[PDB]
Amino acid sequence: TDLVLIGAPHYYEQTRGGQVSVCPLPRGRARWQCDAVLYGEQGQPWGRFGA
Amino acid sequence: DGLRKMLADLQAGWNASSVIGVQTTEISKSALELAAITGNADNLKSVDVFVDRFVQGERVVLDVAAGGIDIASRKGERPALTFITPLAAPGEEQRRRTKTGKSEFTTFVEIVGKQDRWRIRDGAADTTIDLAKVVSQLVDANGVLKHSIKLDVIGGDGDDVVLANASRIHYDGGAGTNTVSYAALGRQDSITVSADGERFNVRKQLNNANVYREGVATQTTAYGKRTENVQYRHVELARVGQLVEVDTLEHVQHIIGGAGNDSITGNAHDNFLAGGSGDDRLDGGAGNDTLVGGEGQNTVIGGAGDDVFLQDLGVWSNQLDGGAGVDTVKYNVHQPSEERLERMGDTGIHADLQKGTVEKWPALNLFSVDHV
Amino acid sequence: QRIQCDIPFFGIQEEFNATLKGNLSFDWYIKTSHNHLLIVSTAEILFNDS
Amino acid sequence: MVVTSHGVSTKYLNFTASENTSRVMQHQYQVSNLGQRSLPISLVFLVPVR
Ligand SMILES: *[C@@H]1O[C@H](CO[C@@H]2O[C@@H](C)[C@@H](O)[C@@H](O)[C@@H]2O)[C@@H](O[C@@H]2O[C@H](CO)[C@@H](O)[C@H](O)[C@H]2NC(C)=O)[C@H](O)[C@H]1NC(C)=O
Ligand SMILES: *[C@@H]1O[C@H](CO)[C@@H](O)[C@H](O)[C@H]1NC(C)=O
Ligand SMILES: *[C@@H]1O[C@H](CO)[C@@H](O)[C@H](O)[C@H]1NC(C)=O
Ligand SMILES: [Ca+2]
Ligand SMILES: [Ca+2]
Ligand SMILES: [Ca+2]
Ligand SMILES: [Ca+2]
Ligand SMILES: [Ca+2]
Ligand SMILES: [Ca+2]
Ligand SMILES: [Ca+2]
């Protein structure tokens, strides 16, 4: 396994709703961090992207 | 009783079915004192030796007067023979009493010393003999070296392992694949093993070695008037500077060096040559040999035959020569460590036999390269 | 005495101390005009300049 | 990469010629790889002995 996708369907922005985070797996004892965030289309509040 | 824990630890570490554990008990100062008060200190004996079996901390024919440890063992058994307390010298102890003039009847100790050897026969099993905690020098009250007590051991039938020491060792492995381990030697020490056919001559150079030696203590008692004195043997530790000893090995196929810079050479049979830590030189000679350089900057010569090299993704650089025949170098024996994964990730090695180099830490240091 | 110590892997952004310890005696002291003598010991790092 | 003396290194010692007591001296150096590379290095200490 390379990465874990984590969804936040109720993230609030004035024009977008929903957020998914890309998390590569930690190496050894290193800390776990997020690197990229995926988003839905614009103008779709409360779209629950990432449910 | 805390000795049960250490006997159990030794039994677990060696994968031993049971541990024998010769123990040596010097006469208590109370007993010798009482022998002085009574006046009959003559016929007493100062050192007594007991032997038991110990499985996980609970419970062999020996003659102290002749230097022979005779233990019986059965095939498939995998026991261990250790010395819990320093083993005394061979031979029989004798005592007398001399008038010594105004001083009242002082001088007492002497040892016959017809033999200067301890002989250990193990029988028929996969026996482990731990030759540490054995006296290697005997001296008088004047501090002069009389004899170098030497150890002779016989192996029998199965795979036998002996862990060496500073004493002059004549190890007869008998049948089976046998091993001698010099892993107790420090970093400042070294061995140089040379082959004389089927026999091995081992020259050990120990710098500031620490060795048990047996002398003669002296306890004295006044009893309201002119003094009567006694003496007794006394094992002790001391560092004797530079020591050179020449061991002899027969029917031994595997040798492990110490923590120093060793030079180990094999013969025409199949050998397991391990160097351990330090900048060791290993040469296998003829036959199909297995060669483990260990840590340090090792130079390894395989010779003829099909040889096996075992590596460990270390930080040092090694020099490896295969010789004639089809040879193999293997890097998969060891599991990668945590810091290796942290610093390098999932990258292993870059090997190229045209260039003749194997890079164990590519793009992180350029000098961790094995030349083959 | 020139003590040379070889480290096969000196890591990135890591550090260590190297103490040099021994006992002294004062039978070598020269009664010069100055009331003191300095004992200087130098430690310098080498590497493959090529 | 830099090498520096460190504070705990002995700064001062004094003695009386009428007394023959000895003393312990330590020179502590600190070595750091502040660069972006890891390399094998060698440390050389010159020690006045006699
Ligand atoms: C200093 O290093 C050079 C070069 O070493 C090579 O390149 C490095 C980056 C590293 O990968 C090393 O493992 C390489 O071997 C040494 O010069 C080489 O020496 C070897 C024998 O020791 C010889 O076979 C090569 O032809 C030499 N190459 C060159 C370009 O000179 C040099 O010996 C090192 N100096 C010291 C004092 O060790
Ligand atoms: C060196 O010694 C000092 C003593 O004050 C200590 O603080 C420091 O951590 C030491 N160096 C390393 C690398 O630990
Ligand atoms: C060094 O000197 C000190 C004080 O004189 C003493 O306590 C210590 O044992 C000495 N150490 C050695 C190794 O001589
Ligand atoms: Ca046997
Ligand atoms: Ca045998
Ligand atoms: Ca070694
Ligand atoms: Ca061989
Ligand atoms: Ca080695
Ligand atoms: Ca060979
Ligand atoms: Ca070969």
Curated annotation (Swiss-Prot), chain D:
Cell location: Cell membrane; Membrane raft
Expression by tissue: Predominantly expressed in monocytes and granulocytes. Expressed in neutrophils (at protein level).
Positions glycosylated per UniProt: 14, 20
Free-text comment about domains: The integrin I-domain (insert) is a VWFA domain. Integrins with I-domains do not undergo protease cleavage.
Role of this protein: Integrin ITGAM/ITGB2 is implicated in various adhesive interactions of monocytes, macrophages and granulocytes as well as in mediating the uptake of complement-coated particles and pathogens. It is identical with CR-3, the receptor for the iC3b fragment of the third complement component. It probably recognizes the R-G-D peptide in C3b. Integrin ITGAM/ITGB2 is also a receptor for fibrinogen, factor X and ICAM1. It recognizes P1 and P2 peptides of fibrinogen gamma chain. Regulates neutrophil migration.
Clinical condition linked: Systemic lupus erythematosus 6: A chronic, relapsing, inflammatory, and often febrile multisystemic disorder of connective tissue, characterized principally by involvement of the skin, joints, kidneys and serosal membranes. It is of unknown etiology, but is thought to represent a failure of the regulatory mechanisms of the autoimmune system. The disease is marked by a wide range of system dysfunctions, an elevated erythrocyte sedimentation rate, and the formation of LE cells in the blood or bone marrow.
Assembly mode: Heterodimer of an alpha and a beta subunit. ITGAM associates with ITGB2. Found in a complex with CD177 and ITGB2/CD18. Interacts with JAM3. Interacts with THBD. Interacts with complement factor H/CFH; this interaction mediates adhesion of neutrophils to pathogens leading to pathogen clearance. Interacts with TMEM268; this interaction inhibits ITGAM degradation via the endosome-lysosome pathway.
Family: Belongs to the integrin alpha chain family.
Protein name as annotated: Integrin alpha-M
Organism: Homo sapiens (Human)
Whole-protein residues included: 927 to 976 of 1152
